[PDB]
Design a protein around this nucleic acid. Structure first.
Ligand SMILES: O=C(O)c1ccc(O)c2ncccc12
Ligand SMILES: [Cl-]
Ligand SMILES: [Fe+2]
Ligand SMILES: [Zn+2]
Ligand SMILES: [Zn+2]
Ligand SMILES: [Zn+2]
Length: 404
DNA sequence: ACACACGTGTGT
DNA sequence: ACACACGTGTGT
């Protein structure tokens, strides 16, 4: 809508936009209700060159880490090359460090782990594997490997609408076999969490939130949540799951995704040094040489303090399946040397904390999560709860009338 | 173009 | 217990 192509990155404003970085701080200070050090903004640069290992699997090159307990809100922004207009700078990620009560995050971790390991039905996804479909990033033990579990409503190409188009009584929280008591406990946890996160979503990304509630009263059966204001329709739980680089292509246009992170008990204090850790990665971005306010020295101090961790290349042994998964293993050397030799190969990661809430337009931005050293969904290093709304979920009763 | 998706119910 | 049926956009 200005008079200033793919190489500048995807253009959208429903998370926030302004003429310069200072304007983004003004927006976020008003939205969040606090000023100054409570809000941190990082400039990130779109390169379009994807960081990945020699086997095609996700890597991080820089890690944005919470700088102190005084930092409450992290915002990643992209300045669009060449633009001087009202939307020259756009917001691509919002992270609330203190998202949900820690006692609730503690309880969800244990309850969801136990329920999903004794009754969970695995939901298969394309991003579970690399391009060649031969990696072992989830682990190779079927009893313990990382896995994804999907609930709520989902879009289906066979009905061009909700997958429950001809389900007399849909089970949004289906578990293995039939146990209504266990499914109701799981449903109660995730419905309560949907209800809690909706006001945070409205507060911090109001334009994306408002888009997601436009047809709430037209398709109530395809929405989660217990109170007025229901932006979500589906939720996926990921337990030690390595999401290879992808976009969520059938998410609705002009919406976003909210991610609630839960972590193992050894990674729940700010001063901690956990044994393992999973990161959320934007593979097409690099970090800036200046901080939010344009200072070179400020950015260097954040690198020395760990607030921005500059990683170096690795060479590790991994497994490679002898035959690809359709649609035995061997030990091979996997390295990231070439991704680190090129300064313009991307890989900006964030380290979300226990109980944090992350907001990003997963439909437009390429993203990934890193593989765990020893995945174990029975005692996961990280659980992510991923809340979204698919496209074409706007018909009553899961679109039963259209299907007829 | 063109292989590829956070599936379910009915049929045989 | 499989077997069939139902057929959408995006990235490349
Ligand atoms: O951060 C995660 O754990 C995550 C995992 C798998 C996904 O498909 C995601 N999609 C959008 C945002 C986050 C995620
Ligand atoms: Cl999204
Ligand atoms: Fe995703
Ligand atoms: Zn992999
Ligand atoms: Zn412009
Ligand atoms: Zn539905």
């Amino acid at each position: 809508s200005c008079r200033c192509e793919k190489d500048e990155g995807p253009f959208y404003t429903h998370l926030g936009a302004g003429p310069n970085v200072a304007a983004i701080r003004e927006i976020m200070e008003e939205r969040f209700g606090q000023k100054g050090k409570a809000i941190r903004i990082e400039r990130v640069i779109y390169t379009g060159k994807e960081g990945k290992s020699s086997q095609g699997c996700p890597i991080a090159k820089w890690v944005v880490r919470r700088s102190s307990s005084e930092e409450k809100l992290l915002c990643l922004v992209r300045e669009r090359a060449g633009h001087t207009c009202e939307a020259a700078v756009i917001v691509i990620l919002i992270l609330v460090w203190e998202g949900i009560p820690l006692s609730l995050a503690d309880k969800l971790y244990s309850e969801l782990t136990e329920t999903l390991r004794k009754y969970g039905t695995l939901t298969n996804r394309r991003c579970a594997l690399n391009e060649e479909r031969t990696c072992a990033c989830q682990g190779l033990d079927p009893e313990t490997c990382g896995a994804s579990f999907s609930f709520g409503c989902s879009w289906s190409m066979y009905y061009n609408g909700c997958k429950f188009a001809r389900s007399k009584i849909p089970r949004k929280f289906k578990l293995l076999g039939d146990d209504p008591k266990e499914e109701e406990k799981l449903e109660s946890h995730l419905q309560n969490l949907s209800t809690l996160m909706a006001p945070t979503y409205k507060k911090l990304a109001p334009d994306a939130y408002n888009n997601q509630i436009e047809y709430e009263h037209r398709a109530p059966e395809c929405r989660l949540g217990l109170k007025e204001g229901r932006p979500f329709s589906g939720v996926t739980a990921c337990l030690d799951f390595c999401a290879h680089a992808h976009r969520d292509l059938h998410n609705m246009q002009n919406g976003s995704t909210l991610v609630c992170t839960l972590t193992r008990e050894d990674n729940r204090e700010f001063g901690g040094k956990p044994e393992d850790e999973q990161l959320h990665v934007l593979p097409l971005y690099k970090v800036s040489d200046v901080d939010e306010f344009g200072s070179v020295e400020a950015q260097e101090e954040k690198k020395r303090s760990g607030a921005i961790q500059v990683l170096s290349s690795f060479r590790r042994k991994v497994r490679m399946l002898a035959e690809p998964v359709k649609t035995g293993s061997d030990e091979v050397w996997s390295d990231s040397e070439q991704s680190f030799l090129d300064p313009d190969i991307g890989g900006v990661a964030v380290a979300p904390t226990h109980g944090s809430i992350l907001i990003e337009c997963a439909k437009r931005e390429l993203h990934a999560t890193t593989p765990l050293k020893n995945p174990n969904r029975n005692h996961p290093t990280r659980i992510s709860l991923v809340f979204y709304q698919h496209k074409s979920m706007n018909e009553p009763k899961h679109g039963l009338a259209l299907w007829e």
